[model samples]
Target: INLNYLANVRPSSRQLAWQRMEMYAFLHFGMNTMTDREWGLGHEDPALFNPRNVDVDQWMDALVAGGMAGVILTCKHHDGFCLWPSRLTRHTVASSPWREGKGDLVREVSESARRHGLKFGVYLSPWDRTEESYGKGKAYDDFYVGQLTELLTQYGPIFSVWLAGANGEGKNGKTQYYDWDRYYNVIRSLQPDAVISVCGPDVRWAGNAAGHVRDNEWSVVPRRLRSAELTTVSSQDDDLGSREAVAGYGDNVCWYPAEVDTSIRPGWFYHQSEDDKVMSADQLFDLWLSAVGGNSSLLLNIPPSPEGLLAEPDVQSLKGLGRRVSEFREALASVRCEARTSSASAAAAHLVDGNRDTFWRPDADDAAPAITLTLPQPTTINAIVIEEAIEHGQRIEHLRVTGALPDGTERVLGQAGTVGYRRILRFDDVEVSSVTLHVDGSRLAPMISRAAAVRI
Candidate 1:
């Protein structure tokens, strides 16, 4: 069978926007923080939810320093405590002692995010143990959708709406049957630009949350749906190693990309005892290379303390992450790069332009296209980076790198799969006056957003 059939798929505007934002600072501060529990019983005392100091701007600042594009907050975690003062629920900050029971964590975060020029997103859990309607199936859909409306309409414009596929037995000991369609419709009507993540329509979960997409993770994957249930059955685990199958257009239609969700801290919510359990800047940078670099969007969780502030250690870690990433970004900033392609076009200049928006794509379909990049002189190539203009869709199925010496001898450098947003392939020292990349394109013509050789 021609695997090219997967090349015909495309993403919607919302999906495109979401795909562009490769990094997000996921904040998961909820009632569970007070209880030091992963999942609260929904019966926790609202009085216990008192953050002495709430610095929304501080949190945004941390993310900005970390090079994240935006922030996604847990508006209402599974504990059923709403961060916003929702009219439909009494179990919210409206009942808490914080800000004299008038605090709206969601509003402060959105406004702060806007001030920092950061996109905003929300995560609202479907399972509510505090709501009696949850046991009533259809009745809970109304409650859930109603709250979603409040969030979508009141928040101005939400960048993403995270609908976790985390349904469990509620306090009533009953399973919640989420009306995902209803939830999607509400967000669709109000926040048209918003991309619903996780179990929502726009983005899918990256099968595992280990922070890294083990194999060069692909943007496209098989679409297996349970017709009777009218829902998707994902192959996140099974599709782990299939590069082309993971990133190209599929036989089953619909372009649902994966988002890699992982935590910086050990717990999603902060606990004083685990103050030192944060991921280092070096670690976060490694994750950045794995998550965003692996073709999947990265949503990294950094929980806020009981005072609603990012801990000092967390801020330092974020800065470290920025420094390492910034260093990589500027590795070849001053170096001269000249590139020639197998089939050239106006876009070819984008290969070393340092701009992610521009790309190099051939005028005609050339699946086995290659580009030869020349630097000032023969030197050890520190690192190899490649990005497929993912907004267009993942096109490169296999990537093979080679080095050409002055003697005309070609040396195989490295090989990788599915260069989605960006893929940084590392190796020991290898010197070359010229380096060439042979791209095995999918069904569609390949587009290279950015490609470069770094000294570090």
Candidate 2:
């Protein structure tokens, strides 16, 4: 007779699958591509849309170079125009001038994504300014459901769905009450596995367009985190956090993780004037460290041009980031390490075992433990990463990482707090033969799963 059963800190199967895809793509393409507007007024003519040289391969290839896992296009933005030909609406690619009105952009994107071995997703905004019955309750719900059905049935295994929180006056000049329950249920029945983002029942927003997450980002939040308001977030975590918590918890615990989203360029849509204003590869790599390395998913929006192709600057930056990640990926693989703890659950070898599941947990008497590593030779270390066996919960409350130059100069990488899935420490590269992690505080007996040093 009890209705509630899964009342613990854990993720669903679908959420786990999505979390594994740490870095991905957000393609903000649609009618706005031609209109040069972030949010179209839904009055633009379909004839204005033309992608004469549209190549979906270019987009997929660019994502590959960027080290992204998948891509999500704006299938339908605030403007009612549809990228796929929807029988429910006249404002779609069916009437667009591109490919003489025979091209289905969705098909092109989805097929190309599969061909390139990447997941595909869609962003369908609830606010439709062009829909005649939008403000009318049941009428628009039916209409919206029909459009969603078309997308779910037509697309092959959509990995995610962006259910945007944006809602405003429709063609009838009034905002409609969203049957969110109905919409979420439809997706659950239709796709059954796709992770719904933002205002969905799955996945929480990382809370900004800045593309970073809090240092203490927790995937398992409370059930009441619907609005992302909580007093648990501390100001002491300001610099430690990539950004403040967009979604935090109070008392109740549930399963909800953060997604850090940001645009590659200044705006979400393409504009000729901002062609040269795209973010550099270094900036993208910084976001990668802050988001993915901070235990949140990073959805970097790399807008496509009106010609339906990724710009060269964005593509170049992406490849640069990919190369940097590759370079530092194996930087700490060969260095040897030993963990010291009085607890039976602890072992220093697990730290360098490349397995997060096996962790080093200090005993009850010794709350604080230490880890020391000896390098094969003096090497430049620019970064250090620490991870917790979050299945046991975020245990590390305060810790310090220290090292020294070959000349015996000391280097203190960090003196900070709470490390959920990971805590990142970075400094100027120092040539050192030895490094140390002094764990001083914790909420429970400290259990560190893994640690690595890298030069980047």
Candidate 3:
């Protein structure tokens, strides 16, 4: 639909969109984790669902410290069983021994999230297992809608609905299918304010393709979709590879963000063997850069054990990651930069000549397709950096630096390349005071992206 509607919204509301969620966590706790199966399928023992150390506060505490914007909890997975007790389903927490069949996971999670001042949402899998009618055409469609209605109406304001494309096997041993219209309508009627992700309006559809979330995210909207927020599952065979590098919607037609979802361990569910395996803080940072920094949100799956507590290793790792992010924020908070559009004949300059100031701004003009920055003097400069004013694509054919040095001699250095949304460009040691950036080609006018000069 009119994707421009996002532009008219306030910054606070826009910040809630999937694209604005630079960093967040995904929790995959459910009956499936207790069973060590990828899908729960209504076979998990309700008695095993209890977490001995169900510390909801601790969970949110780590997330807030880590500087996370929000969290997405798996209220239901491929298995038909619901994490919270649902009147529509017998295979839910209501039948479990946890809280004597009165534990409402969704309520506990939402309240805890609210207490921590973090945005909260749920992922309710449309795929059902307890409902035998799932593969029986129209009957199955109604069953899926019924469960969806329960979640949307019962849960508080949800930020997103994570829909999984897990079609259950039919009676003939093939994957069953249901009408998408029924699914869409149910969500629209109950949670119109919530953004549906991965498989509904205001989001992109999941694809079977395999690439990096940064390179794979489509910024343009496709023909049938209203907005882009495509989420792609890593291929079963590529699980060990980097999730950030896996290709998503390759076509540039989809205007949405890519979400990199991977479990903290080998399986989406908990496994006794994975007790010793924990992702390191460094690894998480790299993953965050590849996913969020690369232009998508990283949905890290933290599966809780039968004791209803996050593994010690997982908890510590998340805390460590949060600390690192906090350091990054502190480091950049004091830095300042500026930008101005350039005319065809105008030559702009920046005074980044001393150690006191570490940033420089450049003048840019889309119509003139040029930018210029002046340095203080021809000092031993090693590299130069360019920043974008807004989030969009840009192309630079040649960069030329020319001006009289301290000795009254003029010299010039040049380079050419393309830059994309919110990126920085660096050039090797090229000592010059006056630098001119020429745009080879561009789509938007007035050159919204900004540029900066940096030392190598």
Candidate 4:
């Protein structure tokens, strides 16, 4: 069987909805915040977990100012501390002195996120260093499922469930074996709309924690990568879904998109010493272009201080990033242009209509199609963005972009592979009378939802 034909995988409706989110916030607030540690020993006192002022609403407001679409809270961490009052574990916020042993951080954060018009998500760590049943068989699995059940049923609605492949040695000197399928079934059965991520089926990590991305990020890859055990090292390989990478697997493939995760600070948890080390607005914008603009979702972590508040420096940087993004929001190509294509099954004019719902498609059998945009006058552009109507499928394999100068000469602007959902290419500013895109290769005729040139 031809592998390219077999690799024609499309994302599920939930995955499509998630991909549209583009970028979201990850809140790593837990016991680690109070202890001033990146990882906890699982033996911290519950009374010491108190924050003088627990303002979850302030955190949501910061995210809103940063233009984040959603927020995911660390409901539990590797230290076995639960932010919510789970009946399965004594190590939870229910024992914390913040609310006189009556606090529930998870509830406050989730509710605040929804109130701010942001989608809510949860990150529950599977490795429990403090639990006595670590490495034990069914007992531990049942305990985990019980905790998961409380989280899913009690929360109004969860958009994403973040999990990691972190299985460390417990205090009892034994490694716990998580029932992966069992955990997945609980999520699916209760919250069918929620997407399991990184260590689960719906999404995969982008290999590093530095907000980096691939030049050719493809969603269709070998099916074996879906395994939690294989995600740690093998998924970090340079190539995942390129023709050379997925050719060996004849019929084993799936639509597993990448999510780039990284902290806004040097560490995932807040520390006063690193306040000066916070990422700058320019740095964050570059990551956005490379990750979210590279056809992958971005999960940027912003940890709360021990006072349970987003710090001033962090908030300032977020607002600056938001401002920078807004300046580039207007598309230069949308001003005045006439779109002409090699062949048409759908109207090419739809590409510049500014509506995401419509799209342009070449003839059904046209494997390689060309689109040329002629502007009323010469324009300077530094960035070009192309998006596929992925509801059909990610079909474009390779593409070339060039700028036509007034002298009747063409200058090669950029080139790339696998235009999954959106592919952004940046080059030095160039003045041109027309911009042309050639779909050099494709699995099927490509459908372009939107394409534009912008100055950044």
Candidate 5:
């Protein structure tokens, strides 16, 4: 296919909605929390899963305070411990002492998420260490499908369905071949709105657990990478959507975006000793800039303590992150801007109109389409946010930002590549009277919907 063809590949409606969320929470609480381990061997006693004062509402409130739009709870982890009471499994909360053996953490978490005006999602691990039929290929597939069906039908309006390529030794050391297509079919039939992630078809992992985002993150990539296991070549490479990169995949491409995930604590499961090891607010805010402020969405994990509440330190960090984001976001102001080129096709006024529906499309013949923004007066700013009207698809590949000092001397402030839905360029604070953005390269004429300068 041609570069223009791949550039035009658009995100599905579900993918679009998921990408717009930008930030969400991942609750990794499971049997591992009580075991004080990242993964359990699946032989822990059901009584050990007991938790006191487990308040799912407290979890939701903390997430709300952190500015998360949704949350994905690990309904079942690799240890085969189901947070919900699964009729097909005896190793679930129904056998635990919580709520007198009547607790359904899945139900409570989903209900609380909706009550707090946040969407809900679920994560069901493919590897099962406790199920008797786990190694008997088809038998295990049947068991897994049953568990998935229960979750899909019980939960209301799932926004995302998370899965992984984690395949470990099954029962009796026999290999278990997952029926991925069958599992995906079940989710489609049950929750059509949900975006199956990673090991499935909808969302790909952002390549690292450290919350690092690609410098040139592209939504368009080879279609073959969609369902491959994590062991295969990942989508984290610096150049996945480049014309040269797409050429190697026989020119087959699709709009599969990224979901950058990382936990607040050192481990995915909570540990009391690590309470003081939580990431600082400054670190989380930098992560926010790289993920949400970059082209991809951020999925930050906040593991619930064995007491069934978010740790105080983690909560404080979340609150601080929200405050920092609010300050940076509110600092954005509309200012006078003009396209330097006289041959442009669309009006530059649309760029600062604060409307995504309107956009300024640069002429295809203009090799270096540029826009210059004139502030009301010399102002101190640290960021320049640019957003492409992605409904038409992502096109801008390389961009350069330059600003003039009080003495009218211009200097390069910052430069980067790839402008998806939103790309926020960060640099040291500088006082300037005018800032200019230049498009260095693109697959096609770029459509800029929004632009602004912010101080933080």
Candidate 6:
């Protein structure tokens, strides 16, 4: 249909769609790079834009080598500048001496990305500081729409549109809040398949507070609800979805598939002064584990220098990170866990039990919701895992385990921290025939997504 209608429809499986992306890269190349500032667009010199050692092939090759799925180049920043030679404005590559006014950075980047087999995307900031007409409602709105039309029509297929703060303020300010309908329509009319990130049809919510997704990332969902369930749900579903459904029918509506973007360094953009601030391999590994491992894809931002080349240290770190990820995949590719019950509890027909395996059921509306799992007989269970099924985004807080021995004595194993779908709990020395995991708290729901017992 239209972009407005397309933005509101939620896909059945947001997590599955995200997992397919695996990993991507956000190339923040714009006036910010030329000026070394994070968020200003007022003063950038087109004369200083020449790169003595520019190499698109090298950048693309590094991305492919590091197992990145795609790349999003910052085509335009808040400064209202264009990376390519746009017919709508003179503040672009046309004003620069990079190729003596003959080359387009967007075209070169798109070609290089295709050759390297990586999906290509672009970020065109809605905020415009250079265009004086931005403050005028109808006039600036049409101007903004024209600019977007050029990018979508001229550029090849774009995977996403990185729409951020309009003119560096809320929608009520210089930002085109009143004219979004027209702008979004332009995007949908041009690139129907493209996904919008964090501000357009879908905004990226801070999935984690620690700057990394956790193994149990699902835990974060409940916390959001606790703060204000109605508000959280409304903001996530209503505002984001209503705008995305106008373009095409896809999950970009509501909680658009999230990408956990982070840089190896503390700063997103590269600075020669921060060369020693490089993140170690271990740190990168932890970030990878939390982001991709936790279900959301990872968008690692690697900034190039004024010479348009990745620094040696950054390249080396990326290669090392790739190797570590590859090794982990190779090692755990064949590992699988199964469910089993304890022999001593074989006569208990109602409850399926394993010596180390346990099933958990949270108290229901009013019932003392509990989970019963049987571990292997005479096994010392060290850990218990519970996985969610429906993606409801619930968490666990209080848990207790009880087991029965052959001598007719019952012993309490220990307590567990918060858990959820695919949650894993560890204990010191829990030796028993059958263990029942009882969860008590509003956080624990009716059923365990999936439960498992790990024997130490």
Per-residue lDDT of 1-456 in model 1, one digit per residue for the tens?
Answer: 344655545678788777777788899997987788778888677899898988988999888888888998899888899999999878999898989998998999999998998999999888777876876888899999889889988877899988777665647668666777777788888888998777765787877776757575655555542121223345445453254344443355457677888888877888787777888888888888767667778889999887778999899999889888777767757566688888875567888787877888875656468888887887777577888776677678788888887777988888887787778877668778888888864446787888887666
Tens-place lDDT per residue, model 6, 4-74, is 32212233342333345667787877666667777765546777677777788898887876777888888
| Residue pairs whose backbone atoms clash in candidate 4 | none
Candidate 3: C-alpha RMSD after superposition: 7.5
Per-residue alpha-carbon lDDT of candidate 4 for residues 1-456, written as tens digits (9 for 90 to 100): 464464357899999999988889999988999999998999788887989988999999988888798999999888888999899878888888889888888889988999999999989888887887767967888988898899899988999988877665647567666788999999999999999998799998878888879878888878878883422327788788877777788678888889999999999999999999999888988888888778889998999999989999999888887777666564543466777888883588878887777889898667569888777888887777888988777777888998999998999998888787888888999888888889888776788988776667
lDDT digits (tens) for residues 1-456 of candidate 5: 476687788888898889889899999998999889988898679999988879889899889988899999999998989999999988999999988889899999999999999999999989887888887889899999999899999878999999977666646566877888898999999999899998878998877888989888888888877856633456557677777778767557888888899999888999999988899889999999888778989999999989889989999999998888777766655344443432464588788877888988887788678888878789888888999888888898899999988998998999989899789999998999888888888878888888887676
Residue clash pairs of candidate 2: 221-254, 339-348
Scored against the true structure, residue 203 in model 3 reaches a CA lDDT of 44
Q: What pairs collide in candidate 1?
A: 6-249, 220-246, 220-247
- How much lDDT does each candidate structure score? 0.78, 0.76, 0.57, 0.84, 0.85, 0.59
Model 3, 1-456: lDDT tens digits are: 222332211112332355556667677887876777777656566777776667778778877876777888888787766878877668788988778888998888888988898778788776667667765878777767777777788767777777765564555663555576677777777877666666655544323221134332333323244322222233222221121221232332333434567766777677778978777777876566555534345677777776667778887888888887666544333223332335433322232222211322223333545555555555554334443322332222233434334565665544433232323333356555555555544333323233545442
Q: For model 4, what is the error of residue 254's alpha carbon versus the real structure, in angstroms, after optimal superposition?
A: 0.2
lDDT agreement of model 2 with the native: 0.76
Per-candidate TM-scores read 0.91, 0.88, 0.73, 0.95, 0.96, 0.67
Stretches of model 6 off by over 4 angstroms after superposition: 1-16, 166-178, 207-210, 214-257, 336-456
User: Which one wins by lDDT: 4 or 5?
Assistant: 5
lDDT of 3: 0.57
At residue 132, give the lDDT of candidate 2.
Answer: 89
Q: Supply candidate 6's per-residue lDDT for 9.
A: 25
Candidate 1 overall Cα lDDT vs. reference?
0.78
Which ranking of candidates, highest lDDT first?
A: 5, 4, 1, 2, 6, 3
Worst 10 residues of 5 by lDDT: 334-343
